Design a protein around this ligand. Structure first.
Ligand SMILES: Cc1cc2nc3c(=O)[nH]c(=O)nc-3n(C[C@H](O)[C@H](O)[C@H](O)COP(=O)(O)OP(=O)(O)OC[C@H]3O[C@@H](n4cnc5c(N)ncnc54)[C@H](O)[C@@H]3O)c2cc1C
Ligand SMILES: Cc1cc2nc3c(=O)[nH]c(=O)nc-3n(C[C@H](O)[C@H](O)[C@H](O)COP(=O)(O)OP(=O)(O)OC[C@H]3O[C@@H](n4cnc5c(N)ncnc54)[C@H](O)[C@@H]3O)c2cc1C
Ligand SMILES: Cc1cc2nc3c(=O)[nH]c(=O)nc-3n(C[C@H](O)[C@H](O)[C@H](O)COP(=O)(O)OP(=O)(O)OC[C@H]3O[C@@H](n4cnc5c(N)ncnc54)[C@H](O)[C@@H]3O)c2cc1C
Ligand SMILES: Cc1cc2nc3c(=O)[nH]c(=O)nc-3n(C[C@H](O)[C@H](O)[C@H](O)COP(=O)(O)OP(=O)(O)OC[C@H]3O[C@@H](n4cnc5c(N)ncnc54)[C@H](O)[C@@H]3O)c2cc1C
Lengths: 367, 372, 374, 364
């Protein structure tokens, strides 16, 4: 199942994702035609059961997919990763049978695209201190703003978090299935970022936004728990993204390595260079196992600490690629390594900054 | 005094002129022709003597300029750095009295802009193995081949160009040439699209039976490799200073943001996870500062400074790239082009690569250690 | 070490370790004397031939269980961990894997039981990293091989009864003319040097060996002449996973001690752990130890099930370097960590070895890089 | 006119043999100290008035740097003696200066600094040793720990709680003499390294201290930290010397030692370490000397930076590795450098504290 998934995703990736990725780096435009295709090829709901219209696979297979896709494109990797793990799964895992049946099949097929609306200008690490309010009068009425929202403006469904009980803090947060055509719900301009060219990261404005009471992702007050619960599987995905990034750095670096001659010998013949390659390879084998064991735990097990470790390790390891080995050429947009640095750095920041991850990890230890 | 005055003068200029220009450069990716001109009028274009039309100041003052300019703009810092250290100085130090007089005043004033042509598709780190030939025919040298990754490319009026006069001698058969931009058969390639240094024109150069006057031969035939490396030393201290400025900008921005930004009921700075980064940044910037200025003080005293300059380049550069932290301290906001830290990373990484990759620098340093 | 079973071995070694190895280890740190009595005991408790089959008088277990043992023992004592590791992986296994049925029967049961102790004899003053360029000669004469030259830095030196010894047959062939020999300790002309005084692994006996027309029986030739280099490296792979497991145990001890101390120790009105300066080290320690764990056990799972050389190199380098990074543990105890009466200072001293023997980390990166550039 | 040259020659001639005896014996080098005394190395930044080489703080720190190339142990003994055993008297202490310093300066007397306690270290403010005046003689009670120069020392600059309800603000500083009634020294500690710099516990049992009150009551915390600044530059200089010894040894060995048909140095794996070592030692050198030049000519942030940088850089002479198996051996000269190095990250303010302090200047 898994060996087959990997080969399927590798071939698709190389054939379809590779050309699209170069267009994304050049255009900075969300790959609407690619997403669609990935949808037809059954990539958009991989750890979703067949009941609700997905591929009926796991978890390792799903994370595996994200790993493989991220080799070729970190952007597409995060789009897929968010879509499923925090755009679809919250419904799958905390939603009711009616909602699962209404919302997931279109998400699974890829006819619909998923988003995760947690972060706010004032709340972003301290996600507990979010300010968006949801006041009920069988219609919830949402007010406030989100920031840095992956899949912004492409997305049809936004899993959105909003205060139902403001005088409780982290405990008074509820979670909502928000549809894109919601009356006072607006999307901000595409944010201009260091990297993940292609992605589509936007602000969201909620102005007395009318969200149906039935779209409450239940029950009221559970939202903070819902968020973090999924962010765990999400973080393994980010780690897998970081992994793919790092492998792409390595493979490119080896081949260039190797071919490129200076001082009468290929640059690789120099230990200054070869030792980097080995270090890259070693930290990538380290990262690999952190990621897949974390995903194997989740595939009924407490996996939170392991997922934090993976995210932090892979991300930091990935940034450690750095461009240098390509030399001057590596500083060039026409060559394939400069993107890996730009893209890498994100991995240390979102779905929980590495400062937070160390904090979380340390909390398990001091337990 | 001269130095303390230079520093304040360059700080004020940078801030009023270089700061607006720098944002235009990050948006347009266009060489800042106007700023350069202005910098020219304000006598920044520094370690040249007054005889030949410069500011008559010393190397510390000059490096100190590059440092300060690089706080605001690494791009403008390298353009300046190249122009002087490797576009102007080779003439100043190895050229003859006639050439000094002909070429330098316009370079010094900033009426003319300087470039340094060494690197080639097949020759970079191993600069010895360059392939551009210069064959004397008819009292004119006749240049053939190509250069790559040339800073100041297409803006520059003078290109200090290195080319084989004696191909069978390898590194020992390289000569150095004062090439003028309007030279027959000398052509400039398209602006290269880079990770960073946004405003700084980096281009290819095509030499097609390019006719260079015999009188533009810079020093004796075969001296070119020595000339190159000799200046690359002062050039490397400048790169280090660039890396320093980059790093200081990262720090200052990071401190301010970290003080103001509140999460968990406290400013983010109150967290040792964060504050400790800042301290590390500050400490490695204090380390870097002294490497740079002692290296420049050695050179100012006419002394052997090669090893120290390598150390500075490698230290500051690596330390600067370590303002991945600044991005982190802002971030998500740090990942955003509207905020001022993402450029520092993009710009930082180059410092590890050009005027001698840090692999080369460690190699060089190690060669001093081993002797012998 | 997941995903059996092997859960029984781990508990068995953990209990033994804590009960018997712990007191012995404090004596070793104080005395610097090889723990003859512990070894004996470990022998009775069936720890001395774990991945040896039952046929030849061992425990009949697999390589994960074995490496697992070494991991557990090294939590308490890195010294005793290496003594065990060498004994089995390079003192007993070369016979097991390359020796003949008669030799296996003669030499292994006593090694397996722990009645006899094993050693590895490769390194020489002039050949270490470049083990190929060893100079000890083995010249067949009379009715006997005749060995000449010297070994250095030999773990289990003077305690050991059997020394798996490598010597030139074969001088004009370099690395291809090396042979391997089962050398017994009471061999005429074979002498042991004084106990070497080391930074750490107190007291894992490390000695010089002098070979003076040393008379080794032809029947003690381990496999075919010229196979010795191959035999050495082949085992050094399983050996390196063991060294990695040693580094792992070291690192986990650093962590566990560091956590406990950091929670209890109060300064500025709060436990030191409440400071991110401190907690973040702990998290890093824990994270790199999870990373290391998987490198080690997957490497050993490959070997249990395949080509494992690259993975073993990765593990050895990763765990070793990670381990030296405690050193944070010393720091976390503060002044007290610099003290011989407290339990962290030994972890540093011990750690550093793990970067050096059974193939320095410079060599390991080289090896790894050779698989990449292939 | 700055020697070095004097301290380098002395070091190599006298300190080198002594240092090998110290590593073997773990015994405080009483005879060397005496000699260093005669050669005018004890009291370097002390004025001549008080007996006194009459030199400046660069020349002093320079001395410590040079000595630490060869020893570390001897370096810290000297460093504590002067910067925190003698200087507190010199800077906070006319009658007392005259009584106590000349013997300290000459090296007839040896100096110590008694701040740290089992319960107070990094948080030195929360010390528990009490000093209660009864009547007109102070009466000291409690314990110190980890005291450099312990049992060799004649004078102990001791800190002790004159106003217990004021915490950090109720600490006083005392000139304690070794023959004081009720003042006892604990057993030699036995450490990872700095073999044998005597490090001991001190027991204060109704210990009778006179006029030996150092400055005004309540000033003790300020006195301590004030000196700990110059002390920290010294520690940095110690870390520097350690690092330079690692480098020089590593270069020579790496050039001579042949494997794979070429000297090990020919390998970039190895050479690159050497270069990094050299580069971080040049970095460290300037941090140290600029910090000391500031103090000579305030200097707190720079001294913290130096201590942290040099110390961490020095520990990074784990790169032992270059000597290989030989480096793990007590007969070879690099294993000591690691063992010794680690201390430099810990005492006179752990590097966690130093980052904290530095960060306080940044955020202020
Ligand atoms: C491309 C992109 C896409 C994103 N997509 C989404 C999305 O789809 N959904 C979503 O919810 N969010 C998204 N984010 C937001 C991201 O989750 C947050 O930005 C992140 O948690 C950091 O929050 P912040 O941006 O408010 O900055 P802050 O959290 O203020 O971080 C600044 C610094 O503070 C540190 N920090 C803060 N508190 C502590 C503490 N207690 N201990 C130690 N360190 C601390 C962090 O290490 C960091 O370096 C995205 C961001 C980016 C760049
Ligand atoms: C912004 C920028 C501006 C520039 N400006 C100029 C200019 O004004 N004039 C000019 O001539 N050139 C310029 N260059 C070119 C620059 O100096 C070169 O990129 C540099 O010398 C290395 O050349 P390379 O890119 O081919 O790297 P290569 O020489 O191909 O080397 C690639 C990698 O291999 C390593 N390597 C190669 N050989 C060895 C060895 N023996 N040991 C260890 N490591 C080795 C390098 O360290 C590097 O990691 C510029 C480049 C940039 C990016
Ligand atoms: C060989 C030796 C000689 C010595 N000589 C002397 C001497 O002559 N005179 C003298 O006065 N003292 C001396 N000391 C004592 C030394 O000053 C102390 O060890 C040190 O100040 C800290 O004390 P501690 O060991 O209790 O560490 P603790 O204060 O318990 O701290 C332990 C750990 O917690 C961390 N920590 C605690 N609080 C914080 C915080 N708020 N933020 C971040 N991190 C924190 C520290 O970084 C450290 O890693 C000596 C020590 C040794 C080992
Ligand atoms: C506790 C301990 C136990 C030991 N046990 C045994 C044992 O049981 N059996 C046994 O045979 N031996 C044993 N040894 C010896 C040990 O294996 C050697 O020290 C090791 O093989 C390295 O060789 P070396 O000591 O000569 O240093 P060298 O190999 O000369 O190396 C010196 C340094 O240079 C590096 N180096 C050398 N050449 C190269 C190169 N081409 N590329 C990159 N780096 C290079 C090394 O990485 C090292 O850092 C032991 C040593 C110790 C300390």
């Amino acid at each position: 199942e898994q060996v087959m998934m990997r080969k399927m995703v590798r071939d698709f990736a190389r054939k379809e994702i590779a050309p699209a990725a170069e267009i994304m780096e050049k255009t900075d435009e969300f790959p609407f035609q690619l997403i669609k295709k990935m949808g037809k090829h059954g990539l958009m709901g991989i750890p979703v059961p067949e009941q609700y219209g997905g591929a009926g696979a796991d978890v390792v297979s799903y994370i595996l997919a994200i790993h493989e896709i991220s080799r070729i494109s970190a952007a597409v990797g995060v789009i897929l990763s968010v879509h499923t793990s925090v755009g679809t799964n919250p419904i799958l895992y905390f939603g009711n049978e009616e909602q699962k049946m209404k919302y997931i099949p279109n998400l699974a097929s890829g006819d619909h695209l998923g988003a995760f609306a947690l972060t706010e200008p004032h709340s972003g690490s301290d996600a507990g201190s979010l300010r968006t309010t949801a006041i009920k009068k069988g219609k919830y009425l949402l007010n406030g703003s989100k920031i840095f929202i992956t899949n912004g403006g492409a997305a049809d469904i936004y899993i959105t978090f909003a205060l139902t009980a403001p005088d409780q803090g982290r405990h008074g947060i509820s979670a909502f299935i928000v549809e894109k055509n919601t009356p006072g719900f607006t999307v901000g301009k595409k944010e201009r970022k260091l990297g993940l060219y292609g992605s589509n990261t936007t602000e969201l404005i909620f102005d007395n936004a009318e969200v149906p009471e039935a779209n409450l992702l239940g029950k009221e007050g559970d939202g903070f728990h819902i968020a973090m619960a999924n962010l765990n599987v999400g973080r393994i995905g980010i780690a897998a993204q970081a992994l793919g990034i790092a492998e792409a750095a390595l493979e490119h670096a080896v081949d260039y390595a190797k071919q490129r001659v200076q001082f009468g010998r290929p640059i690789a013949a120099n230990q200054g260079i070869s030792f980097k390659l080995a270090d890259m390879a070693t930290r990538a084998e380290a990262a690999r196992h952190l990621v897949y064991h974390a995903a194997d735990l989740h595939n009924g097990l407490n996996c939170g600490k392991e997922a934090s470790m993976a995210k932090q390790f892979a991300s930091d390891a990935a940034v450690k690629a750095l461009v240098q080995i390509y030399g001057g050429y590596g500083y060039m947009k026409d060559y394939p390594v400069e993107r890996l640095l730009r893209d890498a750095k994100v991995t240390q920041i979102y779905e929980g900054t590495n400062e937070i991850q160390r904090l979380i990890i340390s909390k398990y230890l001091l337990g």
